Amino acid sequence: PGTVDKKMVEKCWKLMDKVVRLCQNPKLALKNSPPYILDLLPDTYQHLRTILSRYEGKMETLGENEYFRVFMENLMKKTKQTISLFKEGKERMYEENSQPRRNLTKLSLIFSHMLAELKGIFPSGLFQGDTFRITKADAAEFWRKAFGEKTIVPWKSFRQALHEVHPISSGLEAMALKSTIDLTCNDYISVFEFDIFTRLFQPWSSLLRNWNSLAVTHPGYMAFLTYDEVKARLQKFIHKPGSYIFRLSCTRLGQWAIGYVTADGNILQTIPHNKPLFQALIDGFREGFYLFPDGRNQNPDL
Numbered sequence: 001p002g003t004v005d006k007k008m009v010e011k012c013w014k015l016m017d018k019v020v021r022l023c024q025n026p027k028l029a030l031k032n033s034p035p036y037i038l039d040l041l042p043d044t045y046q047h048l049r050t051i052l053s054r055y056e057g058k059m060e061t062l063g064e065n066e067y068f069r070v071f072m073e074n075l076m077k078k079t080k081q082t083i084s085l086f087k088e089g090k091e092r093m094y095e096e097n098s099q100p101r102r103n104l105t106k107l108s109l110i111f112s113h114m115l116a117e118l119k120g121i122f123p124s125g126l127f128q129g130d131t132f133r134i135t136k137a138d139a140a141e142f143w144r145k146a147f148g149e150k151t152i153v154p155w156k157s158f159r160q161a162l163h164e165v166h167p168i169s170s171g172l173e174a175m176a177l178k179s180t181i182d183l184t185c186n187d188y189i190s191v192f193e194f195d196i197f198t199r200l201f202q203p204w205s206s207l208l209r210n211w212n213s214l215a216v217t218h219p220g221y222m223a224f225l226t227y228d229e230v231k232a233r234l235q236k237f238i239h240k241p242g243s244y245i246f247r248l249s250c251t252r253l254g255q256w257a258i259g260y261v262t263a264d265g266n267i268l269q270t271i272p273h274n275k276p277l278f279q280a281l282i283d284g285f286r287e288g289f290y291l292f293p294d295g296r297n298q299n300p301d302l
Ligand code: NA
Pocket: 181, 182, 183, 184, 185, 186, 187, 188, 189, 190, 193
């Protein structure tokens, strides 16, 4: 994870420019829906300029920051990947549902997560990794005890530390867990990524069982969708009140949104308030609102 300097930063901007040009091609019909790479990359540029501005005079400090070195390396890696993706996908980049354009969507989410992480760790351009506030108290305690005030830890150490408190049953569960928590796909877990995961799958006391029940095996789980995609999916069940699904939002990391069909044949969306998703779904079934996950007749018991 190499030391960041002007020329690395400038190479980043040159690579980001190339991705921008690639995604401006009109034959992609690139829709504006979040995550929208054409906004994300300028926004990442602006926040990086802000960081560099704050560390004028102190460029040694910034460039030795462990979190920043890993972040910039990952940013260079993902933009190169995006550039390669275009070079080899060739004509299929213009097929809306091709596998190379589903890969572009996937990279677009990662750019979104990376920007969000960078803003959580460098609010206003100043490094605050070591004072980051973890939302759930049992999770904050776990981080502070295993990792102190580290901002980022390699996946292997994170897995080992977490296994001792929340046993992971197999190599396969470990990989699936890595895919859920390692939002930036850089083989590290930041305190920001750990915040998001423990918020989504609280209560801490049953952490991984909540994750299995909500995001591994639940037919209601949609992973990342927009409001509009949720509505369009539930439109097909407007005749079936009680049909519901739940989603993550790339613009509101760490919270759930539930969409459901009303007895009156409308679709409403609710954000779980001061309860875990787990409980909002139990209450929602009890009250007759969340009965048919993705329209299916069998609803998991929680
Ligand atoms: Na990561």
